[PDB]
């Protein structure tokens, strides 16, 4: 099924950090924790035990095995998925463990400011939804096309590279819900492109995302509550979504 509209947002918090990510578990689990990264690069993640903890800036610091770049990470099943800064390596870091798993996206743009999403200086966007685990990236072959790697969860390996043919120059940002890729306009306020990942075909999508045009750092669908999570100019937002 497809998204027909996005509701008014709920703001959870405003921080000084213009760019960052906030993330919650999306696996069918009782887990109230929140994970945050700040800025476009670093080696630390802040873990909050719950929302009141986030509200009061009471966090545990977790040191990562590799520096992250960008704002396109995701948390799924007690693991952080993220772009290893300055490489085409994607890292899966399980929070109670030492050695992460890694995979390489050999034909993906990953340096020299040739971003997948320029607004957020992002090269890769990891997304988790009802139909699988996905890595959105931009081709280093033609330097333009948006692709989505479909993952195998157990092996943390790529089973398929899906070419949308959509040029990244038209994309503001994106998220994936129920196996459908949704891409925003360059102003990041409307969704103007969509792609049925398992059907391998474009589908019509034109609906408003938000009224604010403030810079958009992170945009991510969480299948556990079916809400859009975003980070907008230091504002942590939640959007409800309406399916057809
Ligand atoms: Na996104």
Numbering used by the authors: 299 to 542
Paper text:
Olfactomedins comprise a large protein family (PFAM: PF02191) with seven phylogenetic branches. These multidomain proteins contain a ~30 kDa olfactomedin (OLF) domain and are predominantly expressed extracellularly in a variety of tissues of multicellular organisms, particularly in vertebrates as well as selected invertebrates. Here we present biophysical, biochemical, and structural characterization of the OLF domain of a second glio-OLF, that from M. musculus (94% identical to R. norvegicus), and H. sapiens noelin/pancortin/olfm1/hOlfA (npoh-OLF), which are both neuronal OLFs, but from different phylogenetic subfamilies. The OLF domain propeller blades are arranged radially around a central hydrophilic cavity.
Gliomedin, also called collomin, collmin, and CRG-L2, is involved in the development of the peripheral nervous system and is phylogenetically most similar to invertebrate OLFs. Human and mouse glio-OLF lack these corresponding Cys residues, and the disulfide bond is replaced with a cation-π interaction involving Arg 476, at an equivalent position to Cys 409 in npoh-OLF, and Phe 541, located within the C-terminal loop immediately after strand E-21. By contrast, key amino acids present in the expected metal binding region in glio-OLF render it unable to form a coordination sphere for Ca2+. In both mouse and rat glio-OLF structures, an apparent Na+ ion is coordinated by Asn 423, Asn 471, Ala 472, Leu 517, and a water molecule. In our structure, this ion assignment was made based on lack of stabilization by Ca2+, Mg2+, or K+ in solution, unresponsiveness to Quin-2, fit of electron density, and refined metal-ligand distances consistent with Na+. In glio-OLF, analogous residues to the Trp/Tyr pair are Asn 417/Asp 486, which are hydrogen bonded; this cross-loop interaction is further stabilized by hydrogen bonding between Asn 417 and the main chain carbonyl oxygen of Thr 484 on loop D-16/D-17. Thus, the available glio-OLF structures appear to be in a closed conformation that prevents access to the central cavity. Comparison of hydrophobic interactions among glio-OLF, npoh-OLF, and myoc-OLF reveals at least 20 more hydrophobic interactions for glio-OLF.
